[PDB]
Amino acid sequence: SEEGPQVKIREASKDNVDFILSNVDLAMANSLRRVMIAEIPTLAIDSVEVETNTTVLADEFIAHRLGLIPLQSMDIEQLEYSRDCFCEDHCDKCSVVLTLQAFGESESTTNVYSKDLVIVSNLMGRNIGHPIIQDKEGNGVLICKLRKGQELKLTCVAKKGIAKEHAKWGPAAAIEFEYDPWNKLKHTDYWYEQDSAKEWPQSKNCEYEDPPNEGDPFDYKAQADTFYMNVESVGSIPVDQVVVRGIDTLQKKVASILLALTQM
Amino acid sequence: SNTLFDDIFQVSEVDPGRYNKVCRIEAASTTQDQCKLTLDINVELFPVAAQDSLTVTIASSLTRSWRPPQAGDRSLADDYDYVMYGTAYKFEEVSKDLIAVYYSFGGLLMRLEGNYRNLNNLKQENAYLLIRR
Amino acid sequence: QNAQRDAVTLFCCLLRSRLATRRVLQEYRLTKQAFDWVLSNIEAQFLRSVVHPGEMVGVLAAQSIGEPATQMTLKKVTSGVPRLKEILNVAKNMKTPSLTVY
Amino acid sequence: YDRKVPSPTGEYVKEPEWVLETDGVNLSEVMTVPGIDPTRIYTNSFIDIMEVLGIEAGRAALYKEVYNVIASDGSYVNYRHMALLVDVMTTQGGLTSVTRHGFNRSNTGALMRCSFEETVEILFEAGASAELDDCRGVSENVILGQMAPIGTGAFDVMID
Amino acid sequence: ASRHGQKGTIGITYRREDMPFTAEGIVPDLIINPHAIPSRMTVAHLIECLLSKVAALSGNEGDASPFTDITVEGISKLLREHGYQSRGFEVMYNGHTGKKLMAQIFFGPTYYQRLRHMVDDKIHARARGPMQVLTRQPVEGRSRDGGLRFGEMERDCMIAHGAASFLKERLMEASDAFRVHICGICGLMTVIAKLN
Amino acid sequence: LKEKAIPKDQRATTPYMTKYERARILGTRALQISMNAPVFVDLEGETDPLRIAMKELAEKKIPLVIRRYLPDGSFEDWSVEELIVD
Amino acid sequence: TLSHLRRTNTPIAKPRQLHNTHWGLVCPAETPEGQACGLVKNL
Amino acid sequence: RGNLMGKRVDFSARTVISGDPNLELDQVGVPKSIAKTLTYPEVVTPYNIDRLTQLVRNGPNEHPGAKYVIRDSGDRIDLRYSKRAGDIQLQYGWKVERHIMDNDPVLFNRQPSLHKMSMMAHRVKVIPYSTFRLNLSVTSPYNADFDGDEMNLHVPQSEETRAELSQLCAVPLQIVSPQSNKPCMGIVQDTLCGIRKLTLRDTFIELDQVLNMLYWVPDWDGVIPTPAIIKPKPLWSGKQILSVAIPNGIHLQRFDEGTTLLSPKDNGMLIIDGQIIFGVVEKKTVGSSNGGLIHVVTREKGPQVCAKLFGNIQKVVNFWLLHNGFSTGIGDTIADGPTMREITETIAEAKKKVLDVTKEAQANLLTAKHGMTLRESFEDNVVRFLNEARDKAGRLAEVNLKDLNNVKQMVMAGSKGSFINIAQMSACVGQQSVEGKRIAFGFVDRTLPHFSKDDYSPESKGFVENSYLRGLTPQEFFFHAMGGREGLIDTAVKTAETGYIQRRLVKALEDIMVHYDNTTRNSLGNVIQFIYGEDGMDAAHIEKQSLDTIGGSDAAFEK
Amino acid sequence: MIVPVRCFSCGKVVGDKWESYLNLLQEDELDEGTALSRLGLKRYCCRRMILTHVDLIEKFLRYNP
Amino acid sequence: FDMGGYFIINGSEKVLIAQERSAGNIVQVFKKAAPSPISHVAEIRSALE
Amino acid sequence: MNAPDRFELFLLGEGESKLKIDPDTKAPNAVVITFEKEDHTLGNLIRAELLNDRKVLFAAYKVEHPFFARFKLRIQTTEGYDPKDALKNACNSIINKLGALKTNFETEWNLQTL
Amino acid sequence: EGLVEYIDAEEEESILIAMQPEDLEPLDVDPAKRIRVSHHATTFTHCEIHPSMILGVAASIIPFPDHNQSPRNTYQSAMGKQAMGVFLTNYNVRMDTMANILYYPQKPLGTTRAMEYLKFRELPAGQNAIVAIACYSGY
RNA sequence: AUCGAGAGG
């Protein structure tokens, strides 16, 4: 297709994507996964006011719990950072307000799942704030447990942020990364007990590259060209957009330098 | 700024002295029975087989920052397939009308022993090395 | 002046031995300009090496013995800190007296 | 014992010799014995050597033992430091030890003496004999918070 | 600390993207220096990473009870059954660059204990604060926002340097300086003081 | 008791300035410099009183003399400009 | 909490060293280090 | 002893310490809240006042600020709450108690203070965390470890006082130590482990790594070195780029027991004028040693270049080690199966020796050695018999450890390790000792109630055949713990006894200073020595050098 | 004292899986290893978040107020 | 999970540390000091149960 | 307590320009750029793409402290080649490769059926 | 029923104890196992319940203390009394002067068999952190 | 403020 880096997708799913980068300089592959982890923005709870807390847990405990809750950030580009808006504290174009209240009416253990979050903000028709639920029963994240006679009443303001400021805005869980399966460019020196090949197992990516010939010498001038990556997303952003918005966030960082140079 | 030495050597001994990408080489000048040579060789770049014959050269040139090949516009000063740069740290007077020279190519060591090159290989930083097929 | 000659006697022995006439010309190959500089350096560098009046050499000495003793922690004789406690608290009742006879 | 000795050619060579290691010490009557060299006999009891061979011979005996504990651990200390300590014990004609009654009974100022041990009693007898402390010691000026004659404080500063 | 005398404070917090990573994307929660191992010979710490690594993968408990016939070889047979290198080594990549690490890293889970010593409970600073009444010196302890002890041991060290004015400064201006009057006939502090 | 000094001839103490009189000199200068005393070198933009005294010392324009007392009570005055600095 | 309840104090002839007779009765290692080590033992 | 010769002081601080590889040697990492709390009186002047008005304007809330202003009248102005904190007219002669700021002299100390090297001046470097950052290679003189240790800090209050720190007590000045006439600070434990890995002849560096490695040196002159390897690929040895940190005019000569000018094992060290010729760098070259690199640079170039030298080596080698990486696993303790079979053979071979010599003593056929009991002679043999088994098993393992073994690599560079640790970890921990002897019969004629009486076997008396890798038996564990307890008592005793010894020496020689003529005297003036050290030198400016006249034949002398 | 939301190392959310994890052990009579594998915790850093977890909250609920 | 074994004085939980003493009413023999005039001693510490 | 606010890792402070530029002393056509509020994401990609240019002589970056998010980048190029232009070609080459990557991924993703 | 006795330190001297019940019984052997000294006694009166009981409560927590140096086990036993964890379930009710509770404690992946009677799995004092041994930076 | 304990390196 287009000249430059190539992508051949091995596998894909709702929250997993497995693909092969081709004709890419290594620094781009690393710089991609760094921004893909901790600079692609996403909305998650960054403020909490607790009316009543009769639970075992402390409020700040419950507050930290709410921070790591997966909230939808598909249309997060249409939302704005609270520090950027002109509101007094938080407007409806920068903040999404959630409410949560549950009482132990049942004469048994009453849980507080993530589905019990209720949105009290004008959404303005964007796919924002809906808490992610992959739980089969639809409950989602188990936040807290309640006895009889216990209740919890709090309000959650969900703002927009970057995972560098706090890991709760993390859009992706874990990116798999292996570029040389046979170590044919000798970038790592193997630790061996009897035989390096017999102790260390074959990587799964070894099936997708050419086995070396020890009779041939070491290709000195060769460089890393083909990369094997697998991205996993928690759900706040679908997998395709995790990498894509990660690519785009990289461009926006580069252009700011290009723009700043024009200013000088 | 021309060549300081030229000869052909046949290797007598090659050993991996507790190294994996470097061997120590032991050769003597062919068509000569009083001049021999020791040198450290990066085997991974140039595999040196036993009982091989290799053309060897030394130049005074061909300070200032080393720049990359630059599209090869600057033509190489070598039709050879192996090159190194170092410094002579001492010249040894084995006997009268006999001499041996010690070279260090960034830790890779060389010992060239002979007689004839008396008016050559002065105490100077520049020491290039060539090896042909 | 004799205290001066006594205080430098060992160093001059090193000086004459290394700056011997056969050694300078056959081993060092020193030229007149080079030789005078070596003479220049030695005089100053020696004069720099002389101790400075006012230095509290005792407290330095006491500490200089103190730190290694603190590191001391572990053919049968009194050794280490117990022996050191003897030497300082001069011990009539030496735990391990011995006489080396030649 | 191993030993290096001058060979007739001049270089040193290993010249082994038999040596008698002892348990127990009475030096006065073992050096006056035939078949031994009374110029090389030695004790690890420097206090006997001080009694028999004079105080200055005990000095080198004192150093060699102090040296032995350091080098047995493998450590190195320069000669001047141990020798300073040694000569301090030796200079008073005897083996003035580093303890509350060994050295701390000198003619030094009482404030200098009262800071180590037996504090109150030193000042008592100092008030009894009415000794005049010259405040030339460091501890006297540390007590008084004055610039002690220490390096920077060893001299005065004046103008043209 | 771990359960084997492996004390140690945090020197830096690195973000996950700065942290080195395995091929499976797993990242370390914590990094210990390898030099702490040889001198202290805490081999049980080394074995704990091995057994705990197999326990998480296997979904079974790890039996580190003493005086058992539990061998590192038997564990390594299990771990290599689960695809990882038998001796706990794992290929790791640099986080800053993505270039492979020349040294394969010993990687695994290990029980670690957050110890009772936090820093902000120990931080203490003072500049001319409260003073005791009798000594006229600064009060003792950080709890009362007191002063640090410039002890005799430290006084010796300043003498070794020769810093005479500093030694006086710590001993006069830093604490309990005072002005007294003395009579020239009887050199005692019994002068009638009518200063103004 | 009085005038127990020694003239410049028959001065026996070290001509080289010890680090202990230097640090006292540099500190004593930087102290009075800190209190708006005159500066006698054309400073090259340096504003640290200690940095002044160091460069003010290299030009030897410091009107101070070192009274080096001796254990008998005698003493030798040594001018800073004649004192050596290595 | 458990370790404080199984604790032993010994006032003030080589007590601090782990004794042979301590086999099975006292923990060989659980004892506060530094000052007054070995006098204080845990069962 | 506690309120006059030592006392509480103002302008002091204390905080948990940790080390920064990207920090200079003479600096100190001071937290902001410490910098906010500590203050230095700086009298106003025409060239500082433009800085001071802004400092007062900042206020003590945020740094660089100030907390107080002292008018000429005498009354103190408090900036935390005052009506005139916003508008101030700084008259000349006024004092401003400004915040502690960057590159100021402070006294950095760690108790216990047995050293001048334990209270050294430092350059203030305000940092955004509440830990005392210090350079990684200033551990040894303080004996600081980042396992929880805390340190102290003091702040001068006058110009002369500031000078004494920078001109007498500075870290660069104490780099050479009068104690042991050698340096006290060296490259330790990562730079040391890495500089050996870096300097290997097998270690080669590609261009991209070199340019970053080259830039990391702060004093790089922009001179790209001509690569050691050319046309097949432009490569650099670790020796190549590492020599860029070494200043010109440095000359190093060292041969060690296997060393020609050719050095087939790359032993020894040859360095010519800011470039190294051959030899792996290790602790002898770059540690606190007599003929070490630090001793040379401090002597010729000076303390400043030597103080800068530390950081330049650190920043390069920490960088290369960061991207090369280093670890230590548990597979590094395992030896060959065939090696293990030889190990247990070596143990059982010494076991039969013990049994046989025991039989010799049982039949009263043992010749009594002179001066000792037959039993003492019996114990003496078996102690030596088992130590040889422990030592032979360790060297039988140390031979088996390949070059890649990371435990061996730390030993080979001398970073942290010894041969004995290898023996105990892999082959056999050895024989326990209580009070100089084997484990005694605490129980009646037996060490433990699982042995029959009058058992003098290796196991019964406290020999541990197994290794830490192999694992100790129940009895071995109690014996091993029995030996360990004495080590803890000995450690508590040695620390306690030595602290007394040090104080006694200090209070005895506290008045001894070299007077203006080199007469070593006390307060009264009693001549300890007539020349300090009998030559009048300072121990720092002193190096061990050979006098070739002493040795050698009378014939070789003549020629 | 309650099921952590996400793994500290991966960051993958794990709070939804605790209730399901327990039902797999008791209702299905499974073992712990296959339970974590059924839930999708394929990396061991995630596994030790739930396998090692001790749900102390049930003890806290027993207190009456 | 509280195991007990403590007292509650002024609301602060106090523990009695087990105290160690050499047993009473048993006979022991001690080799006394070489400079001591007596060379041996047999001690029993007598106290009623 | 003393820790900085965690937004300082990307938010430019008061008067802190994103790029500061300074000439290298004792070096021809050599300049160093003080990137602010940036980590190894930018430095490594600029440097490794600069190295692909054949008219550039030197390119390397360093984080003088992992505390602060900032790094220094120095470049040296041929005479008649301002490093600003060498920087710009690398950046534009990066964005073109990234934009080419984005389109190829979307093509392969939309092809993929799940 | 007379199947277990209470042995004093003094009564210990008159008896013979067996370490393992495999010591009362009548080549190919695993090389990796520890070297058990073959028992050389027959007059056994008692057998040890399990040698693990020589250690206290805190030393029981240490995993593989047999494979560790003796001082280290002493050090840890002092630090486990400083390790933050849930000290009691009624921590919210009591009003202790100081209390420190871990957010998400977890049982260790390597457990002594003696832990179950200390309720350590039920009341842990640390977390199974993912630990790497490496020199990444110089921190 | 006196004494007391447990802990830090």
Ligand SMILES: Nc1ncnc2c1ncn2[C@@H]1O[C@H](COP(=O)(O)CP(=O)(O)OP(=O)(O)O)[C@@H](O)[C@H]1O
């Ligand atoms: N030759 C050596 N040089 C420097 N450190 C060494 C060393 N040998 C061992 N070490 C390290 O120093 C440590 C000593 O610490 P410990 O034995 O636990 C008591 P400490 O922490 O040193 O207290 P202390 O500093 O007051 O003496 C050893 O554990 C080891 O890691």
Ligand SMILES: [Mg+2]
């Ligand atoms: Mg420490």
Ligand SMILES: [Zn+2]
């Ligand atoms: Zn808004």
Ligand SMILES: [Zn+2]
């Ligand atoms: Zn009067």
Ligand SMILES: [Zn+2]
């Ligand atoms: Zn995870």
